[PDB]
């Protein structure tokens, strides 16, 4: 064949930290479908939002929003336990169907996005040029977000351990840990990955007794 229909930009959803995660790649032939299971980042999250995006940039905020919906009623469970399957399906007429279904509860929600939605030819070209001009920056953004999300987890899991060690943790250890958590919490708000990693390292160095238990 010498011509065919494709979807002209990547399609996906916003994930933790403001990132666009791709479910269908740019220039994929239509019709097409793809699913991916996602979970929750923190304990006891019972409601989630699926924000649908078109584009090639790593910051969700720089892509074209196509719509959104929420999924409610998920049993409050530990971080990473919910299994929420997200399915993008584009039919032969360019209509995009997005669904999310929580496997434990069977709760489901969906949206239909019409084929004329999203960016036009000129904005499509501009998007691809902008993503190429910002490729290094977007890579660095994705690496910062991966570090931030790790560091966020380390703060939470450390505070939980401090709480449950209680008395068994010497005062001087708890003082050192408390001060390292503060520093890490500060570094996470900035945009220097190595500063965050350095603060994780300083926290591990004062945490050894806390992980003896």
């Amino acid at each position: 064949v010498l011509l065919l229909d494709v979807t002209p930009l990547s399609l996906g959803i916003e994930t933790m930290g403001g990132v666009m995660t791709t479910l269908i790649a740019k220039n994929t032939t239509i019709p097409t479908k793809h699913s991916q299971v996602f979970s929750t980042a923190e304990d006891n999250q019972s409601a989630v939002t699926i924000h649908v995006l078109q584009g090639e940039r790593k910051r969700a905020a720089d892509n074209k929003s196509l719509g959104q919906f929420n999924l409610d009623g998920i049993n409050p469970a530990p971080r990473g336990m919910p299994q929420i399957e997200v399915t993008f399906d584009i039919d032969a007429d360019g209509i995009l169907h997005v669904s999310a279904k929580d496997k434990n509860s069977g709760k489901e929600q969906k949206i239909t996005i019409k084929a004329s939605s999203g960016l036009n030819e000129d904005e499509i070209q501009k998007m691809v040029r902008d993503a190429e001009a910002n490729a290094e920056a977007d890579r660095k953004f994705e690496e910062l977000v991966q570090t931030r999300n790790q560091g966020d987890h380390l703060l939470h899991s450390t505070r939980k351990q401090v709480e449950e060690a209680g008395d068994k943790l010497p005062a001087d250890d708890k003082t050192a840990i408390e001060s390292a958590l503060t520093a890490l919490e500060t570094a996470l708000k900035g945009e220097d990955k190595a500063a965050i990693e350095a603060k994780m390292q300083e926290l591990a160095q004062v945490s050894q007794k806390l992980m003896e238990i």
Binding site: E14, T15, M16, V37, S39, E42, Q45, V48, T49, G80
Partner: peptide, 8 residues
């Protein structure tokens, strides 16, 4: 990793 945003 495939995690949704935290609650608003």
């Amino acid at each position: 990793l495939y995690a949704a945003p935290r609650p608003t």
